[PDB]
Design a protein around this motif. Sequence first.
Motif, PDB file in Angstrom:
ATOM      1  N   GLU A 368      36.877  40.507  32.682  1.00 19.16           N
ATOM      2  CA  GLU A 368      35.608  41.488  33.000  1.00 19.16           C
ATOM      3  C   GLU A 368      35.824  42.992  32.723  1.00 19.16           C
ATOM      4  N   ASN A 371      34.189  46.717  30.303  1.00 18.17           N
ATOM      5  CA  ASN A 371      32.733  47.044  30.952  1.00 18.17           C
ATOM      6  C   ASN A 371      32.814  48.566  31.202  1.00 18.17           C
ATOM      7  N   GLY A 374      32.281  49.296  34.936  1.00 21.62           N
ATOM      8  CA  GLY A 374      33.291  48.570  35.828  1.00 21.62           C
ATOM      9  C   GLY A 374      34.956  48.709  35.247  1.00 21.62           C
ATOM     10  N   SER A 375      35.182  49.787  34.636  1.00 23.85           N
ATOM     11  CA  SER A 375      36.583  50.045  34.346  1.00 23.85           C
ATOM     12  C   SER A 375      36.797  51.389  33.702  1.00 23.85           C
ATOM     13  N   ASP A 406      34.146  39.650  28.380  1.00 20.50           N
ATOM     14  CA  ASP A 406      32.852  40.183  28.490  1.00 20.50           C
ATOM     15  C   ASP A 406      32.734  41.586  27.894  1.00 20.50           C
ATOM     16  N   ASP A 438      27.376  41.551  26.662  1.00 19.87           N
ATOM     17  CA  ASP A 438      26.803  41.841  27.937  1.00 19.87           C
ATOM     18  C   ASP A 438      25.710  42.937  27.756  1.00 19.87           C
ATOM     19  N   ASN A 459      24.859  37.212  27.589  1.00 18.62           N
ATOM     20  CA  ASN A 459      24.531  37.476  28.696  1.00 18.62           C
ATOM     21  C   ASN A 459      23.943  38.849  29.058  1.00 18.62           C
ATOM     22  N   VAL A 485      23.668  32.796  29.159  1.00 22.05           N
ATOM     23  CA  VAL A 485      24.034  32.691  30.527  1.00 22.05           C
ATOM     24  C   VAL A 485      22.465  33.130  30.807  1.00 22.05           C
ATOM     25  N   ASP A 526      23.535  31.466  35.814  1.00 25.12           N
ATOM     26  CA  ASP A 526      24.085  32.740  36.948  1.00 25.12           C
ATOM     27  C   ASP A 526      23.080  32.936  37.997  1.00 25.12           C
ATOM     28  N   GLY A 565      29.790  36.432  38.794  1.00 25.38           N
ATOM     29  CA  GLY A 565      30.654  37.704  38.910  1.00 25.38           C
ATOM     30  C   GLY A 565      31.382  37.819  39.968  1.00 25.38           C
ATOM     31  N   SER A 567      33.807  39.192  41.533  1.00 28.97           N
ATOM     32  CA  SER A 567      34.227  40.637  42.116  1.00 28.97           C
ATOM     33  C   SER A 567      33.140  41.572  42.753  1.00 28.97           C
ATOM     34  N   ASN A 568      31.846  41.079  42.737  1.00 29.30           N
ATOM     35  CA  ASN A 568      30.790  41.756  43.438  1.00 29.30           C
ATOM     36  C   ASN A 568      30.601  41.412  44.855  1.00 29.30           C
ATOM     37  N   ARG A 578      39.771  43.129  48.595  1.00 34.92           N
ATOM     38  CA  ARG A 578      38.927  42.701  47.691  1.00 34.92           C
ATOM     39  C   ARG A 578      39.419  41.656  46.650  1.00 34.92           C
ATOM     40  N   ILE A 598      33.405  35.099  35.645  1.00 33.86           N
ATOM     41  CA  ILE A 598      33.580  36.496  35.258  1.00 33.86           C
ATOM     42  C   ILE A 598      34.478  37.311  36.347  1.00 33.86           C
TER      43      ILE A 598
END
Length: 867
Positions: A368, A371, A374-375, A406, A438, A459, A485, A526, A565, A567-568, A578, A598
């Motif tokens: 993942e 992103n 997200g990173s 992704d 994505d 996606n 997706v 999804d 996903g 991690s959400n 987490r 993901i």
Amino acid sequence: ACSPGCRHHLGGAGWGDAPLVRLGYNKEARAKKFPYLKALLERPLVFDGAMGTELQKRDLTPEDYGGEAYFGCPEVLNRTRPEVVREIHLAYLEAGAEVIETNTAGALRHVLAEYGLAAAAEELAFLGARIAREAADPHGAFVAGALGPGTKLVSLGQISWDALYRAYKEAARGLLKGGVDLILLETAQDILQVRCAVLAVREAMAEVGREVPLQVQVTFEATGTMLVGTDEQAALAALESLPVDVVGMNCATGPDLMDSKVAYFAEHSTRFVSCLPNAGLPRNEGGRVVYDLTPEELAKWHLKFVAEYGVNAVGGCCGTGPEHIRKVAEAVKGLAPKPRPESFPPQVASLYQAVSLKQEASLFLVGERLNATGSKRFREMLFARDLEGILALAREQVEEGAHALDLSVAWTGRDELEDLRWLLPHLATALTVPVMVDSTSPEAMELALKYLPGRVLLNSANLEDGLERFDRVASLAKAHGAALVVLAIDEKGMAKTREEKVRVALRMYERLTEHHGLRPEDLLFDLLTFPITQGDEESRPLAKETLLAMEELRERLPGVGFVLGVSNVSFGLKPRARRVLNSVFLDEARKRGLTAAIVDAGKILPISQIPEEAYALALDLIYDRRKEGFDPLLAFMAYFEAHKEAAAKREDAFLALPLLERLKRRVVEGRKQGLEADLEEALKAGHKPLDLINGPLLAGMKEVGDLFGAGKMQLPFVLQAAEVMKRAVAYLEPHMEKKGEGKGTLVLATVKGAVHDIGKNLVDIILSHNGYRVVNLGIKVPIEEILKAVEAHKPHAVGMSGLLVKSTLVMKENLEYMRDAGYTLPVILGGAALTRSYVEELRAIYPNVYYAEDAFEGLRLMEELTG
Ligand code: B12
Ligand SMILES: CN1c2c(nc(N)[nH]c2=O)NC[C@@H]1CNc1ccc(C(=O)N[C@@H](CCC(=O)O)C(=O)O)cc1
Ligand SMILES: [K+]
Ligand SMILES: [Zn+2]
Ligand SMILES: [Zn+2]
């Protein structure tokens, strides 16, 4: 039923005679339409032998090709000498070839440009088609409209998509007007070129109003892959979701090495199967140009293929003749064709290998961390334009369990497309695993598909912004033959309850399968992962709602997959908390029907490795198990702030090897990040600059050559290694003690008449990266111009290249010229038909002539002669 988003031209819809529908390849329905496919069911059709090696047998002169400018072009012979092409067609028909091929493989703008005929591809395609009908209609035989791969590899940036698309579109018009019974894409070397050429000719079908069958065929190199490094498992996986009809092989090396490849195509392909080997590579037996495959042996191969494996179409390529087809037409007549497999296992693929979407007792894991939102690390290196750093990240998630990756570049106040055009050329060959693109922008997905090989994932598609965007993206996934997706959001909002999730998943499923003709096995549904840990009340049952929907939809939609996903689920918690909740949510999801996720792959904990008090509180969160008094969220945070290392991860020291070994492994593995720091570390430790070049740096360069030749490393990774070597030489070059000179200089050129440059420009790159000076004079260079450059540049050797046997006779003429002009310096010959024997023959003219099988022998020869 349609909306303005719909575009069913290239891929086809779910109704009528579309190549793919919800139950796979349309076998019975398309046969009824196309008499070529109707006959493949009934009997093994026989194809022609070669066109070019027949044209070479004739007493042909420059005037037969309309002058000196076009001497050696097959395509101009449809205009200048139509009867010579017909003569060959007719001789295969009298031998018994139910299908013949239009003399039109080189009929492309960028190939034809090299004869000053760039505007003329549609013309020469039309003429070669018309000739073929005039032969075939008398004998009652089919015509196949041949198109080749060209001179320019799209994956490695030698031509854009858009030009390559332009060329195949116009050449296909020419064939379709001339009345071809199918289009045939052949001798393909680059899996992205295949997708480009398939979409092109499908559009030219929509323009002229006539739809013909599609036959796509690759060549494997001796090493066992396509030139750009795609295996048979990946090639097939790419072709099995595209609008094609027959898949197969041609040319390559002969039947011996083609055997296991066609065994694979024959066993697994739901399409029909073609197979057309050449007579092997040519030799020179005392003047005369000889091929080693007899007609008796080719019959004994095609009998095995047709009767054991179940191959439908059989024929020959370069260096076969009427005698080969005669014995083939005998051996195969009256064999009862085996029916092709009914379904195909869902997979995706990179440039190099395929990956199953079903993993046994397990998950398809999508890393993942590419992103921008997200990173932090990715975001930073994207904007700093740090390419090496992004490949280290991507490489890193593979080492930890990533089946695919992704990619999300979206960020406020950046251009999503500008960042994508920088990144995707590098990723297209860098990555060893498939991409999931994505984006909320349909134009971003569109761009991505013009760059990324293999079979890809998109996606996502949803009904957030209505039916336009949904259909847009669904058509796009149908055309490029990508997995889709499907997110569960409709025009009224996000689907929170289980009843809302089903309704929406059920409706989209119906648009995709019945309307757009997508298989279930193409869809990853999804449902939504919302954060249950933020603090609020209404949010508590939301992970429960999703697991219960997914176990309902598994029973109601057999074929489909599901993606989340995960991690959400954990937002509003500390890093270590987490990690544990995400690992537990993931495992409960697998039980309820999840096939894909993901995730941050290396921060997935096995359930065995989780504390039991933590595990059970994770369950209490995920399923909303709340007593009066007991608050499972407080107890869950309480736990992590108490127990100190409950989810702590250090990972380090992968390259903590010996210094000299590390430097060598940098070349082989192609890793430049950290290179200059280590090279400095080595110099401080007493190592001499010139000892490091000829020690660990040269050894990994021999190893790169050793692996490539054996099929254990692919071409792009070889160009990576040389790039590492380039940087290394640049670093240590200032510090060396016996300074004042270079390694050596090579004037290089393709010979008079020779148009192909891929392998000349590989030798350029590989030798230049190893600190050889290379004056590349280009193609079709006369010897008078070669020796002008030499007299000016004072090189250490001359290199001559060319693909064909006529190229080899031109090099003999060039040695007779060079001998008589008095030259004494070293010449180095290479070329695809050029053999080692013939060069030793040429040593009688010019003693200092050498042979190169590949650019790593050039490496060896340059070292040897320069000193
Ligand atoms: C795909 C293919 C093609 C591609 C070429 C793509 C390209 N290179 O641009 C296409 C389809 C375009 C092509 C065309 C033709 N093909 Co063709 N093709 C092949 C194939 C499979 C070779 C594939 C290839 O590209 N390999 C990869 C490249 C990178 O390798 P390379 O060129 O050998 O270069 C390497 C080495 O030789 C070396 N090297 C090369 N030059 C030099 C120079 C120096 C100084 C050094 C050190 C090293 C060196 O380094 C390179 C990398 O290490 C071979 C069969 C085979 N398995 O070899 C037939 C082959 C070349 N083709 C052949 C034929 C007959 C043709 C055509 C005439 C066919 C026709 N329909 O008329 C046409 C050419 C028409 C024209 N306009 O002149 C024959 C030639 C023999 C002959 N003349 O009798 C072969 C040998 C097939 C056979 N008979 O078995 N071909
Ligand atoms: C909603 N998401 C989602 C999707 N794609 C699909 N199909 N479904 C989804 O639910 N794409 C984006 C995201 C999944 N990806 C991600 C990526 C990272 C993080 C994450 O938690 N990132 C950390 C920062 C990590 C760091 O900077 O080191 C964060 O705190 O946001 C979450 C989800
Ligand atoms: K043929
Ligand atoms: Zn439609
Ligand atoms: Zn061939």
